[PDB]
Write a protein that binds this DNA or RNA. Structure first.
Ligand SMILES: [Zn+2]
Ligand SMILES: [Zn+2]
Lengths: 178, 618, 647, 178
RNA sequence: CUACAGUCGCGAAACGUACGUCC
RNA sequence: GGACGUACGUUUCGCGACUGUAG
């Protein structure tokens, strides 16, 4: 929030919500309960623990910051939109996402176990430049270090996504104002 | 060499003092070292000239050969004679001569019951230390209880010489069908009286050192609900009501032949109903020898189709509709080729009129089995969190095991899995890691429990309460005095022996009346009970030349009934020492008595009584 | 020349004229006791009457040795002593032998064949019959097929003057019994099937029997297997490779067998390989020329699987190097045989890892520990006493020359000379002479009774090496079955002879009725002409209308189109059986079939191709289905005899 | 203990002891095990029943005594360490010994087949003067009854070798006082 | 007392390969 | 070519017996 803002925070769709999540009407605050919520089962319901957003794409102005505290196992990243709903995020060949595994290392996928250092990121913010080819993820106060590198195939819709192992009930992910 | 830990010294410490004990060591191949420690100490303690003789009762041939290999690799270097007897070894070497030349014998226990029956072993005083495996199965009529019947009947009464020290090696003494700490205390005292034992020693001091080894996992209950748009159950229930209306049209007494009044589709209540009306339909004596055949054949076909429909409903309620569909379709094809009848043509035509409707509704991914897809969701979430875990998924019934393997092959998302039936990722084994998922079965390890009925979670909570009650009951008993405990178990054993020696005269009467044997399905005359021969008291056959024209043959040859459309398999062609006479099964007959007018049913050849005439070649 | 007392304590119940089961443990004792009974039997007749005692002998060296003994003793009394073999029963009439002799020593298959033929129409023409080694009179054996013709004469009620039927053994045998009374049931069943009443044993002269008994002591030595089996790992990788290559041309391979999990290097794996290879010979695909490649490729893959499976067993029993030598010899044989795109591929698969296998075979640390203490126990007792002769019983023919090679090149075992008898310190044999006071049973399970000569006992050792305790416990209970055999003999000796000859009559009559009820006639011969294909190429060999039968046992093919479908090759061991002379050993005349079809033989004047149904596949031309009939008597069809007037 | 003390009693060493023998925790009672046991495999295992000692040579003071009663057949003598382990005691180039053969005869081996009478010592001791290669086998108390003399080529230390008949489990020897 | 899975014991049979013998 | 025997291994079938689960 120290340089100029370019874009705003995304919103989640109720058309592809997870079957165990309880995202409220503010649509930037996810919440998990115990019993899976009975919805209509079609080719658009995800039926897994991946959560997408509803922002339309642009050239180079993208910024949002999510509060990743109070969560044990999470994986947030931005990838392609047109994929089969029976597939999950991170196994595709075109996915810039960080998979924080339960084995206590900040891993990430490029399809290829591309494992990184051993940080515990407090507040993750995804800053995307599809026009200029510069990907930056400034976590906490550390001279604005990205700590992750991606090359992108900018020829596709690039919706932002979330993925989190929700079987700890009361787990939440929340987006704040920058 | 392997290392003896401290709790495995503490567990074996009381039994080495000469008391008949019941160790309650937890699992993890720990008790198979405690037993080794006790054997090593017990064979050492006899002075020169005399000797000890350990006998280790296993219970299954895997466990038997496993413990034989372990005792061989551990005791052969020190100069003892380890051996092993089983059912796998042929009829050789009278057992009193193996056990006179060995010092560690691994019996399966039915061998010792057999050798004590015919007196080829004199008595249990030949051994000096008996070691049971899984001693908590010493129960109502289990072979451990027959051995201990002989042990206690030798102890009390006609006093013999020295008796062996008894050791039990359970992992959970299993206090089931109790309610509170009182009934658990009475049951555990009853079991410890049934082993003639006095100490229930378990680890107390370094319990935290045991906690370094065993990982009691944390559970995950999954109460998930059933489907709603049951067009499959609608069509199948219409077919079942249609067949019931046809059977009620023919019989007009079907509602009073059974005693289960309220009937619900797709459960064991309807199964008990259809089994009871099947047992009631055959027993009809009437003065129309063609109409009894016609009525019983029609009722056999209708009730067997109803029973197959009910089991198809039960299978489809727990697995995919495709599995019940291939089950139903191969059933209908296997009965269509069996025998042609206008009843059978009617029922097959009525099903195949709806068959394409069932295939159109069933093969729809919107009508997905919810418990199965929640299992798939859990499978993918765990395997994406950890791609190194394994699952040993337990299922109730083997048909559901094979159907779930058919699903995991027919799931394109789960390409990364390899099922196994009982190098691998997932095992599907019924009633025999990191994930012990229980598909409705009543270090980094979790166990799930998926259900479609709320109340088996209540049974699991009752089970957890029973487990806490069992630990509290053994911790209550363990602080007792010893002498009052031994008086208590002595009076329990004397009372149980007194009950044992007052009612044990189940001596039946061989009947001299000639009878006839009818077919179970078509009710046609097969033979007479004055005609059958029993060869070596286990091979009941028919020596009769009129019998030779009343079956059609089709492993070896399996016979069938010779009627025009009966197709009822009676028994099987077998080859004797020279001959090729066919044996029959009484489970496919109806006994009728030629003096009286009854048509009584039987289930196995031991219960049905007559004068058994042995088979001779002359 | 001069008898002893135990040799006359045995011969005393036989001279009374009653049938006996004399059981003497001396090799020269049986010959002298039979000599005494044969001497006393002839000299008791009145004037004009002749004795025609016939002494059976089952083997050929025993037959010729008893002929040399019985002629060089009964020459001075003028008794005509002759003998018939299979090498003498041709071109000589049997009937004019029996009328012109007294002490015939024929081998029993001659008498069974002549009783089937019709000459010697009854066994009443003899006056004594001696059975040497009589405990083979059990079931369908040529002693029992003679005792069948004897007992159908005695129990028929049409009896004449039946001869004495005494029999000489060394161990009456217990068989499948467990306790003492089952041993009594077996010995009574043997005495009923041999029609005797008294069992004679040395009782008063145990000192004269203990001085010559050859009783050694046993020294069971359980030895473990190896721990780092690199060779089993590499051949397991190759066998998985060949199995995965075998599935690409048969996707349903795992449906062809009902066996559970199969592990490499047991006999269960060879059972699975044999079942798969037989199941892949009955394909009926409509191409009929790709099938000639698919079945050939399946046969080749299963043959290489079987060769690796044999090399695994030879490595786990013998030294490691002989497995690689056996595999290399088989691959040299297939290099000299022929080459196609399958065999070039498999040979170039083996050559990829040949160097790794040859380097891992030459390690000085990877001996079999069984061989490692075999050399120890051979270098102990020889060092103790360098005048000790040993014999080494090995189970298989393939391991009897591995260990012959192994001492050829051992630095610790230079003082041995291998003496293979399948100037000799050791004798590496498979199945057996009372000169060797050391017997070593290299994993070899009736005990090996070495009581043969006219010698002494003097102390021997009977070391037994193994790798699994089943071998140990089998001998541990063989000793107890021998312990109860003597007690069963002694209990049977204390019955009354009026009740014993009635007790055996029950068993004789009951067994006669059981044998006579199983005289079911032939099945109906299915008329239609089927045809035979090879088991590797599945090319047309002949039809089943060209099949002629020589002597109701052997089969030939008479057609002229068959003459171009095989190629001859000279036989490695030509001999003469019963009308014949093995000339050649035929093979299939395709490009690369070369399958063993049979034998080319000289019967009377001709040269005919005697074939076997074991290496063929019978196919019905009506439907089109193929079957595997594995013996000639099970393939039921229209059997037409051979006629020399046709060709 | 009868004449002058000239040596200290030997000790069997646990690295060149052969794979069938089981000397005890005092390392002076040699016996034959029931079943042969797994040991280490190197250039020092004799693969027979031969064992050596750790008594180095001296000028002339060596005399040692072991209890050889209740051994079935034995062989006692001296051997050099520079010898192949596959070899036999008394049949090498230079290793002198005395054998108790299977014919109940006490013979001797030296590089030939020299033989004593039918004597069998319960106790025999070997006298050694290491500067000149002399031996005297004084058995027990009978006017120093030696009955054989051997020349020893003192060009190496003289760790004395012992072989016993290894096919009898429980067969033993014991080192005793001189 | 009905179904369901899990186990043990007793007898009968067939097959494969290897080894030895005989015609 | 064929017949016999022995050893090892595998499979099949019948008859019992026992325990647990749910109705
Ligand atoms: Zn019928
Ligand atoms: Zn061919």
């Amino acid at each position: 929030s120290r340089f100029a803002q370019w874009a705003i925070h995304p919103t989640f769709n109720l058309k592809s919500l997870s079957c165990s999540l309880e995202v409220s009407k503010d649509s930037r605050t996810v919440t998990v309960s115990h019993r899976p919520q009975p919805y209509r089962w079609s080719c658009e319901r995800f039926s897994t623990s991946q959560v997408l957003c509803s922002q339309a794409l642009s050239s180079g102005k993208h910024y949002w910051e999510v509060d990743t505290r109070n969560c044990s196992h999470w994986a947030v990243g931005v990838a392609s939109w047109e994929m089969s709903r029976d597939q999950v995020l991170g196994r595709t060949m075109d996915s810039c996402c960080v998979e924080w595994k339960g084995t206590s290392q900040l891993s990430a996928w490029h399809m290829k176990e591309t494992v990184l250092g051993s940080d515990r990121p407090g507040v993750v913010g995804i800053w995307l430049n599809l026009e200029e080819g510069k990907l930056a993820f400034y976590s906490v106060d550390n001279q604005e270090k990205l700590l992750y590198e991606c090359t992108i195939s900018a020829s596709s819709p690039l919706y932002p996504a979330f993925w989190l192992y929700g079987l700890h009930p009361g787990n939440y992910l929340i987006i704040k104002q920058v | 060499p392997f290392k003896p830990r401290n709790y495995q010294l503490e567990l074996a410490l009381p039994a080495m003092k000469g008391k008949n004990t019941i160790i309650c060591a937890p699992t993890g191949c720990g008790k198979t070292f405690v037993s080794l420690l006790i054997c090593e100490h017990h064979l050492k303690k006899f002075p020169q000239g005399q000797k000890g003789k350990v006998v280790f009762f296993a219970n299954q041939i895997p466990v038997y050969e496993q413990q034989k290999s372990v005792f061989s690799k551990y005791f052969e270097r020190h100069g003892y004679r380890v051996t092993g007897i089983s059912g796998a070894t042929a009829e050789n070497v009278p057992v009193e001569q193996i056990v006179e030349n060995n010092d560690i014998i691994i019996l399966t226990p039915q061998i010792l019951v057999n050798n004590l029956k015919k007196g080829t072993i004199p008595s249990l005083s030949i051994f000096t230390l008996m070691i049971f495996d899984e001693c908590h199965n010493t129960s109502k009529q289990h072979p451990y209880n027959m051995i201990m019947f002989n042990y206690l009947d030798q102890k009390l009464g006609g006093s013999s010489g020295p008796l062996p020290q008894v050791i039990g090696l359970t992992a959970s003494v299993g206090v089931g069908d109790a309610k509170n700490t009182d009934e658990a205390l009475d049951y555990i005292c009853k079991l410890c009286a049934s082993l003639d034992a006095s100490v229930i020693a378990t680890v107390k001091h370094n319990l935290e050192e045991l906690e370094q080894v065993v990982y009691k996992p944390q559970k995950f209950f999954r109460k998930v609900e059933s489907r709603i748009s049951d067009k499959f159950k609608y069509i199948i229930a219409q077919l079942m009501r249609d067949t019931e209306s046809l059977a009620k049209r023919i019989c007009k007494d079907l509602e009073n032949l059974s005693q289960i009044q309220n009937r619900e589709f797709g459960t064991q209540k309807y199964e008990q109903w259809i089994v009871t009306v099947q047992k009631a339909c055959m027993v009809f004596q009437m003065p129309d020898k063609d109409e009894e055949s016609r009525i019983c054949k029609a009722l056999f076909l209708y009730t067997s189709h109803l029973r197959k429909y009910n089991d198809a409903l039960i299978i489809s309620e727990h697995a995919r509709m495709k599995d019940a569909l291939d089950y139903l379709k191969d059933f209908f094809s296997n009965v269509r080729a069996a025998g042609f009848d206008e009843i059978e043509q009617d029922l097959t035509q009525r099903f195949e009129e709806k068959l394409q409707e069932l295939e159109s509704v069933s093969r729809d991914p919107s009508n997905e089995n919810p418990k199965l897809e929640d299992l798939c969701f859990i499978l993918q979430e765990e395997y994406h969190l950890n791609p190194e875990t394994i699952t040993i998924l337990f299922v109730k019934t083997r048909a559901l095991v094979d159907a779930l393997k058919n699903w995991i092959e027919g799931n394109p998302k789960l390409s990364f899995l390899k099922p196994g039936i009982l190098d691998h990722n997932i095992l599907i084994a019924t009633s025999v890691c990191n994930l012990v998922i229980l598909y409705e079965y009543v270090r980094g390890s979790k166990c799930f429990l998926l259900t479609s009925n709320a109340g088996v979670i209540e049974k699991e909570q009752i089970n957890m309460y029973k487990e806490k009650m069992m630990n509290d009951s053994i911790l209550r008993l363990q602080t007792w005095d010893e002498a009052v405990f031994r008086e208590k178990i002595l009076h329990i054993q004397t009372h149980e022996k007194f009950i044992r020696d007052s009612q044990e005269k189940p001596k039946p009467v061989p009947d001299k009346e000639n009878k006839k044997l009818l077919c179970r399905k078509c009710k046609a005359l097969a033979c007479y009970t004055a005609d059958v021969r029993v060869i070596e008291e286990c091979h009941y056959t028919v020596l009769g030349d009129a019998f030779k024209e009343c079956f059609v043959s089709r492993k070896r040859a399996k016979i069938f009934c010779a009627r025009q459309n009966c197709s009822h398999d009676w028994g099987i062609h077998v080859k004797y020492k020279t001959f090729e006479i066919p044996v029959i099964k009484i489970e496919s007959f109806v006994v009728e008595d030629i003096a009286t007018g009854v048509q009584t049913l039987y289930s196995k050849w031991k219960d049905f009584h007559f004068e058994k005439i042995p088979f001779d070649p002359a």
